[PDB]
Amino acid sequence: MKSGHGCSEPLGLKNNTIPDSQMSASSSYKTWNLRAFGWYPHLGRLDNQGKINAWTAQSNSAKEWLQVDLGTQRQVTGIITQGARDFGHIQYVASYKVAHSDDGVQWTVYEEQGSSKVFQGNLDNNSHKKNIFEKPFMARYVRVLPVSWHNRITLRLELLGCLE
């Protein structure tokens, strides 16, 4: 005799508990890639044990890109972003092109201007920004490529779903 109002669920902070195999970027502030893992992504998650609570870039340039591999094909009904800082200096990305792919070949960048407008917005580091189910759909892998950042490429991108 219950009902399900909430439609925006996490990807590893409820039941899925997805491990460190969901997010992944070219390189992080860590140092580089090389053999083994190298990067230490998957910080966007809340209740961060460390402090960063957000993935940063390596070359601190536009050549860096953050992608998310799911391989589970789930329908998303929202999103959420959060910036980070450097033990004091507040950093956050502004202009960034984020596209989602369900089959892997079709990268939906979500145009608007008429051609292919990128996703702009700082939202600071101490201010999270989520998006309602303005246009839900199944996804298997998403790609993000930041162009205009502020201070340093330190942010976190998370997608929410309905699980229905």
Q: What is the total count of domains within the chain?
A: 1
For residue 45, give the amino acid letter. Answer: R
Residue 24 Cα distances to 33, 89, 98, angstroms: 11, 24, 14
Burial classification of residue 10, based on how many CB atoms lie within 10 Å of its CB (0-12 exposed, 13-18 middle, 19 or more buried): middle
CATH of the domain at 76: 2.60.120.260
> Which residue range(s) make up the domain with 73?
1-164
Measuring CA to CA, which residue among 84, 99, 85, 80 is closest to residue 145?
99
Solved with: NMR
Which contacts of 8-11 are long-range, i.e. CB under 8 A and separated by 24 or more positions? 8/77, 8/78, 8/130, 8/132, 8/133, 8/160, 8/161, 8/162, 9/160, 9/161, 9/162, 9/163, 10/158, 10/160, 11/70, 11/158, 11/159, 11/160, 11/161
